[PDB]
Amino acid sequence: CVATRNSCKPAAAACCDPAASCYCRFFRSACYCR
């Protein structure tokens, strides 16, 4: 869905890529594409 550590989703950190998977940090309340 997104490149990496940029913008998993157009609003926060929520990737869509099936093979990939962001990382929930909580600091911002979301999961960034590590």
Helix (H), strand (E), coil (C) string for the chain = CCCCCCCCECCECECCCCCCCCEECCCCCCEECC
Instruction: Give the structural domain span for 34.
Output: 1-34
Residue with tokens 């600091």: 27
Asked if 17 and 6 count as a contact pair (C-beta separation under 8 A), the reply is no
Q: Per the structure, how many domains does the chain have?
A: 1
Phi, psi of 33 (to 5 degrees): -70, 85
Least Cα distance to 3 among 25, 28, 17, 23 occurs for 17
CB atoms within 10 A of CB 27: 8
What does the block give as tokens for 33? 């594409």
> In this structure, which amino acid lies at residue 19?
A
Computed on alpha carbons and rounded to an integer, the radius of gyration of the chain in Å comes to 8
